[PDB]
Design a protein around this ligand. Structure first.
Ligand SMILES: [K+]
Length: 157
């Protein structure tokens, strides 16, 4: 209900994660820019803070999908180990799970893990977008956003 845990070393290499580059809001700056570069929706609706590697998102008035959306992009920074969600939602949306890619897994393999079916790799990857590069282009530490598999009966191919 507050903090989310991520990988640290894994994610977009925005800065020199070896030390933290320069300063707190500068680290955040990269993150904000990163979300704008990637094209993360509602990334302007929120706000990002950085505490060495503990990022904090805030904002209000978006959907929960938008909120977590930012979390993923912010929590997938090389240098960021976690994201403190402080952003508020104005409209009802479906909540998702967060799965961290392990060394050897593919979008399919993890989809099969989270959904029970690998064919749902797209639902994840496209949801991890535009943060995620490509399905088989994941990387160890990629905490992919796992949308809620509504009605397990049918749907899944
Ligand atoms: K990270």
């Amino acid at each position: 209900m507050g903090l989310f845990n991520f990988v640290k070393d894994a994610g977009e290499k925005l800065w020199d994660a070896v030390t933290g580059q320069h300063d707190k809001d500068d680290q955040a700056k990269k993150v904000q820019e990163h979300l704008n570069k990637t094209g993360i929706p509602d990334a302007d609706k929120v706000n990002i803070q950085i505490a060495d590697g503990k990022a904090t998102v805030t904002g209000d008035g978006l959907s929960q999908e938008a909120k977590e959306k930012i979390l993923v992009a912010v929590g997938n920074i090389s240098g960021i180990a976690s994201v403190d969600d402080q952003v508020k939602t104005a409209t009802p949306a479906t909540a998702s799970q967060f799965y961290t890619v392990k060394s050897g897994d593919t979008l399919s393999a993890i989809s099969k893990q989270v959904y029970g079916n690998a064919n749902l790799y797209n639902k994840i990857f496209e949801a991890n977008k535009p943060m995620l590069k490509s399905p088989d282009k994941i990387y160890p530490g990629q905490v992919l956003r796992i949308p809620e598999e509504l009605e397990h009966h049918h749907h899944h191919h």
